[PDB]
Curated annotation (Swiss-Prot):
Official protein name in the record: Biflaviolin synthase CYP158A2
Keyword Heme attached: yes
Top-level EC class as recorded in UniProt: oxidoreductase
Name of the coding gene: cyp158a2
BP term (GO), one: pigment metabolic process
Organism: Streptomyces coelicolor (strain ATCC BAA-471 / A3(2) / M145)
Stated family: Belongs to the cytochrome P450 family.
Length: 403
């Protein structure tokens, strides 16, 4: 019985700033190589496994045999020189503890929960768009709207005072500053970890609808510890700005394809489905994020993952799975059920998914029908994207309209 292979060599995945929303050439390679591959990233050390197919990604992210808690142990190979989550944040918690932590704020993030901030956010967005309309056609449709809106929405939902929004943005970008943008990221994490400790403890020891009040209440009832509450609050706060990057890519795409743009401009009722397809397609991040450690031996597509080995999943790769999404690279606003995974999978799935969709829907409504014929001020290829980041997106989005 011939001796075959299951030894894909370790392939280096250097830090590379990609153009616009173009797919990562290296990930394409890894995908076709096989369902299970091995990678080496800029920071940390080792060669972690990489899963890329839709079904296997769901398996790894939803199976108790793969944990996050142990990732803190050794120094797994990764993109960021530092680890983003705190030593007790949900990102580094497994089911037992992870479950009661997510349960503490779950009601604030369901479709029903986030719809409660819908109208409030709409007014907030109109104020930003109106201010832009007042300034003048030449505008940066990121600094004017895409950045300020998501920041205001997450701050209002978290219970962060408007006067502190600038601090949140400063710290978040230093932490997600592609991390290799220094490492000054650790001090920024600590400062943010101190801010939320104060907020949760200070004032949030009463009754409010905001998330920090909810967390403070849970801490007071001894349901979760401080630190657990702070760790979760910080990840929610930084994650809230993910909509800036993503919607930036969303509008760059739309403004690059007149066919797609007019259809959304003419058919408002198809916008929710269309936005979900865009979310599937847009390559949200550079490379991969946070791995999981095999807690025991597990076989994936004929490959034995040894206990202790690190394993990454690529949600971007899974969203381009030919088997699940026929003609993966094509943007089809109709799309069958299309269960992408841009918001992750398993216990760690994004708590902000519904909120992100709500924000994107409001942004599209305002940008397409509030601003008279908005359009890119330069060629799609001339739009500058962030070069040295974790979450991909425009550094600036030059636009004009018709006023
Ligand atoms: C279109 C915008 C967004 C995208 C594409 C996105 C995507 C993701 C992905 C891929 C993960 C990884 C799941 C894993 O660990 O395997 C994640 C986690 C997370 N996201 Fe988002 N996200 C978005 C917006 C948000 C927003 C607005 C918030 C704040 C409400 C948020 C909060 C979080 C948190 C707290 C986690 C960690 C969950 C955990 O480990 O339990 N996300 N997100
Ligand atoms: O763990 C990941 C991860 O592995 C990939 C991500 O994109 C991500 C993210 O966008 C936000 C997060 O809170 C966590 C992650
Ligand atoms: O981009 C990353 C990333 O590269 C690793 C992360 O762990 C992470 C995270 O825990 C939360 C985030 O919002 C983003 C990230």
């Amino acid at each position: 019985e011939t001796i075959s292979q299951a030894v894909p060599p370790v392939r280096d995945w250097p830090a590379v700033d990609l153009p616009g929303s173009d797919f990562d050439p290296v990930l394409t390679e890894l995908m076709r190589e096989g369902p299970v591959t091995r990678i080496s990233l800029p920071n940390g050390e080792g060669w972690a496994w990489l899963v890329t197919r839709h079904d296997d990604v769901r398996l790894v992210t939803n199976d108790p045999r793969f944990g996050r808690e142990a990732v803190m142990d050794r120094q797994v190979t990764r993109l960021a020189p530092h680890f983003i989550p705190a030593r007790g944040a949900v990102g580094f918690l497994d089911p037992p503890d992870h479950t009661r932590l997510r349960r503490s704020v779950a009601a604030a993030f369901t479709a029903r929960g986030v719809e409660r901030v819908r109208e409030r956010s709409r007014g907030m967005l109109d104020e930003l768009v109106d201010a832009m309309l007042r300034a003048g056609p030449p505008a940066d449709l990121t600094e004017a709207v895409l950045s300020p809106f998501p920041i205001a929405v997450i701050c209002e939902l978290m219970g962060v005072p408007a006067t502190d929004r600038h601090s949140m943005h400063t710290w978040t970008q230093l932490i997600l500053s592609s991390s290799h943008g220094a490492e000054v990221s650790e001090r920024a994490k600590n400062e943010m970890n101190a801010y939320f400790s104060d907020l949760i403890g200070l004032r949030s020891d009463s009754a409010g609808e905001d998330v920090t009040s909810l967390l403070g209440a849970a801490v007071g009832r001894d349901e979760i510890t401080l630190s657990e509450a702070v760790g979760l609050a910080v990840l929610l706060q930084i994650g809230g700005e993910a909509v800036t990057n993503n919607s930036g890519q969303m509008f760059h795409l739309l403004l690059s394809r007149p066919e797609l743009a007019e259809r959304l401009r003419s058919e408002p009722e198809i916008r929710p489905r269309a936005i979900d397809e865009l979310l599937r397609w847009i390559p949200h991040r550079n490379a991969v994020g946070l791995s999981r450690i095999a807690l025991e031996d597990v076989e994936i597509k004929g490959v034995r993952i040894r206990a202790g080995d690190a394993v990454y999943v690529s949600y971007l790769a899974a969203n381009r799975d030919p088997e699940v999404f026929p003609d993966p690279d094509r943007i089809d606003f109709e799309r069958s059920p299309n269960p992408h995974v841009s918001f992750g999978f398993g216990p760690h799935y994004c708590p902000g998914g519904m909120l992100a969709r709500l924000e994107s829907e409001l942004l599209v409504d305002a940008v397409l029908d509030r601003v008279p014929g908005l359009k890119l001020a330069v060629a799609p290829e001339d739009v500058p994207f962030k070069k040295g980041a974790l979450i991909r997106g425009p550094e600036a989005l030059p636009v004009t309209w018709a006023a």
